[PDB]
């Protein structure tokens, strides 16, 4: 029944694509002419967070914007006081190949994941003085790519084995599993409500999931190469996909189709990270063009560059309040870029 | 403000510890293995991620990467090894008589490695893996089974001069990347002391570049 099911599946694609075309009368770029462009956003490197001695692979901010955790290839998960350029802690990492770090919403816990496929979780506010690991999370046969805490006792992890999984750190075993991808999953972004999350894979497919069950709520296509960055919209019903094809694509959960593209003729560099501001109006994405080109998300027009890095802008993310953006790049440093008055 | 002074002092202490860790981190090499599942790199390390084999040969700790079990798309995670002293590649010398394809994926991957935007300066080392078996294979069968344009001559020296040269012709950056070559002889020292010599050479070149000579 190969062709028999293929015909029905093609009918399904035709119906859903026709529904998308009927709902999407035109691209949102045309309809956004009402809102004013943000203009050239000059972001001075207010604090240069020097002190990290390798390529910054993932920077994360606790729910209080003061603290951040920056992960690099040197195996130094270092908690930083972005207010005074102070190192609250310097956690050694078991695996130095971390490509993702996470600050727990409580703030008591920090996790790092990467090649070893275990998302070790660390105890920050202990009775004693030091910061200790709580429990590692083994069970992934690929390479771990993005941990994001849901609560204090639930770690979401997308790996390179084309699957993703929810965990319970009290026991150490996966409560659910999310296998719907064909290529290695690169970026998993958790929603503000953490009831859903989106993970992007190397097959140019981004798939929304439901945390409670484990069934693929949606799938997304449109990219022409491997997706390298996904981060939810503050509204929690969107995300953006920066792929190695030198573009980024904005999606929607209720529309199930691509909306915008963030490419230009003069850029042929692949995106290595993506983040949003508090209002989502700025979609700061770290190109491998050695400049964290701030892409106006609502306009898909480059309305700012934060070129201050000697190497490719590997990771970056706004804080909880968005007062800072730390484009810690493959250059050893992190810079706190804030709008100067 | 006294608490802030104490916090600043604690941060300066953490800076002192971070620099002491980072000097060792910069001192550590990042020798990356690569190849196929049938390459047989297990032999090299004989004497669910990376098995980061940290050893020490000449008072310089070497962090080898048995990342051959990744079983993933290397194009999406090989950029994590941009800064390494060297890259060890165990060649698929099984093309003499064993097929499946007589080790043309070796060339298919070596060309990608050489032309990769991140391995311009990374002096990749080429190791003739399964050399002992490949010598008998080439003595018992010719080489033109899957290399029609080659000479072969059914000799160990010509087998290298053909197979290795096939990939070294794909090697384009002859000025920046200094590829070494050592036939993998199953011995106690000459299998890893040559790697030590090569990493010392590449570290010397990188040090000269950094100092500006």
């Amino acid at each position, epitope marked *: 029944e190969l062709d028999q099911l293929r015909q029905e599946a093609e009918q399904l694609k035709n119906q859903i694509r026709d529904a998308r075309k009927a709902c999407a009368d035109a691209t949102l770029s045309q309809i956004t002419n009402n809102i004013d462009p943000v203009g050239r956003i000059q972001m001075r490197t207010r604090r240069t967070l020097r002190g990290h001695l390798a390529k910054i692979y993932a920077m994360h901010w606790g729910t209080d914007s*003061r*603290l951040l955790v920056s992960a690099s290839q040197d195996g130094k998960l270092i908690i930083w*006081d972005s*207010y005074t350029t*102070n190192k*609250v*802690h310097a956690i050694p990492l078991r695996s130095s190949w971390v490509m993702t770090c996470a600050y727990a919403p409580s703030g008591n816990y920090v996790a790092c994941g990467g090649l070893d496929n275990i998302c070790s979780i660390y105890n920050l506010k202990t*009775r*004693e*003085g*030091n910061v200790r690991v709580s429990r590692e999370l083994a069970g992934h046969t690929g390479y771990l790519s993005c941990c994001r805490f849901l609560d204090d006792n639930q770690i979401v992890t997308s790996s390179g084995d084309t699957t993703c999984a929810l965990w319970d750190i009290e026991t150490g075993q996966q409560t659910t599993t999310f296998t719907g991808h064909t290529g290695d999953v690169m970026s998993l972004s958790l929603a503000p409500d953490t009831r859903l999350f989106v993970s992007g894979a190397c097959d140019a497919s981004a798939k929304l999931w439901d945390v409670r069950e484990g069934m693929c709520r949606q799938t997304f296509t449109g990219h022409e190469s491997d997706i390298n960055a996904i981060c939810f919209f503050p509204n929690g019903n969107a995300f953006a996909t920066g792929s190695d094809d030198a573009t980024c694509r904005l999606f929607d959960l209720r529309a199930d189709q691509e909306l915008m593209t963030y490419s230009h003729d003069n850029i042929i560099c692949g995106i290595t990270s993506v983040s949003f501001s508090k209002s989502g109006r700025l979609l700061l994405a770290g190109y491998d063009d050695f400049n964290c080109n701030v892409w106006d998300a609502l306009k898909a027009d480059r309305a700012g560059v934060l070129a201050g890095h000697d190497n490719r802008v590997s990771c970056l993310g706004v804080t909880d309040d968005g007062m800072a953006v730390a484009t810690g790049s493959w250059d050893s440093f992190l810079k706190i870029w804030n709008g100067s008055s | *403000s*006294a*608490e*802030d*002074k*104490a*916090a600043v*002092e*604690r941060s300066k*202490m953490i800076d002192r510890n971070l620099r002491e860790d980072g000097e060792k981190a910069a001192r550590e090499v990042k020798l990356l293995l690569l190849g196929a599942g049938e390459s047989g790199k297990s032999t090299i390390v004989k004497q669910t991620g990376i098995v980061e084999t940290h050893f020490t040969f000449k008072d310089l700790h070497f962090k080898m990467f048995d990342v051959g079990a990744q079983r993933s798309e290397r194009k999406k995670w090989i950029h994590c090894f941009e800064g390494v002293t060297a890259i060890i590649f165990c060649v698929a010398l099984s093309d003499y008589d064993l097929v499946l394809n007589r080790m043309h994926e070796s060339m298919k991957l070596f060309d990608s490695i050489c032309n990769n935007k991140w391995f311009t300066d990374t002096s990749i080392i080429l190791f003739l893996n399964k050399k002992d078996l490949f010598e008998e294979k080439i003595k018992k069968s010719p080489l033109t089974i899957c290399y029609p344009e080659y000479a072969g001559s059914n000799t160990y020296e010509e087998a290298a001069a053909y197979i290795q040269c096939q990939f070294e012709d794909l090697n384009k950056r002859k000025d920046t990347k200094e590829i070494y070559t050592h036939f993998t002889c199953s011995t106690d020292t000459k299998n890893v002391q040559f790697v030590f010599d090569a990493v010392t050479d590449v570290i010397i070149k990188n040090n000269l570049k950094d100092c500006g000579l």
Partner: single-chain antibody
Framework: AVQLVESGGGLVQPGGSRKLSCSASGFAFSSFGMHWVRQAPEKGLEWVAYISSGSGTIYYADTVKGRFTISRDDPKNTLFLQMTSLRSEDTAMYYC??????????????WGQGTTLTVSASDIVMTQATSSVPVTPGESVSISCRSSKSLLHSNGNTYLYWFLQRPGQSPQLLIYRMSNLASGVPDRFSGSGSGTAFTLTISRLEAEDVGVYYCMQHLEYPLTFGAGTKLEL
């Protein structure tokens, strides 16, 4: 299993010298700054020595400035204090304290059991008035000690450390600084204030709630300890 026990002293001849030592266990003391709190019998507390996290900024009190010396053995997790030419005023009970200094840390949280020393016979101070207002365990009591200057700094952290010296053992950190609660304390012991006013809002009292409270000041260089109080049963 955090354990702070100190030994050394108990009887001092006039014009003599004595040695103090505090033993720390159950926590990363090497990354912890430590204070030193004396306690005259039937009186309040008094700070005598201090060394920062990593032996950085050694401090001393004016009353024993030069006479005393404080040093930490971080690898051995033990404290060393030498007191020479002790005067008659040095008839008091000591209390080893720990402190970690970072963003939102827990300073002066754990106090040592205590070692008493007996000898035969320009800065800010706080008002430990209202010597006793005893109340039945079914009521609430608010305590306070006043400071001349505004406590809040540009950082906003106001240091009016709250403690409760229960009879027989060391005070327990109720609220380090003046805004944030402590580890192990219940929800009853609270605190609030605005600049110079403060209110140690305590919800309910029981058998353990008895004891004389005390306050510390960490804003200026000298840690003027709190004056004697009564359990106000």
């Amino acid at each position: 299993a955090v354990q702070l026990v100190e030994s050394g002293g108990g009887l001092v001849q006039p014009g003599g010298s004595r040695k103090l030592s505090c033993s720390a266990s159950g926590f990363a003391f090497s990354s912890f700054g430590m204070h030193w709190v004396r306690q005259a019998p039937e009186k309040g507390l008094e700070w005598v020595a201090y060394i920062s996290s990593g032996s950085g900024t050694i401090y001393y009190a004016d009353t024993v400035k030069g006479r005393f010396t404080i040093s930490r053995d971080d690898p051995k997790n033990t404290l060393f204090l030498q007191m020479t030419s002790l005067r008659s005023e040095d008839t008091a009970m000591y209390y080893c304290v720990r402190s970690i200094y970072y963003y939102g840390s827990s300073p002066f949280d754990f106090w040592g059991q205590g070692t008493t020393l007996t000898v035969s016979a320009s800065d800010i101070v706080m008002t430990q008035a209202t010597s006793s207002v005893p109340v039945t365990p079914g009521e609430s009591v608010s305590i306070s000690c006043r400071s001349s200057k505004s406590l809040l700094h540009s950082n906003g952290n106001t240091y009016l450390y709250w403690f409760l010296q229960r009879p027989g053992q060391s005070p327990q950190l109720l609220i380090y600084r003046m805004s944030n609660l402590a580890s192990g304390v219940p929800d009853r012991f609270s605190g609030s204030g605005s600049g110079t006013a403060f209110t140690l809002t305590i919800s309910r009292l029981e058998a353990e709630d008895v004891g004389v409270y005390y306050c510390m000041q960490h804003l200026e260089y000298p840690l003027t300890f709190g004056a004697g109080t009564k359990l106000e049963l």
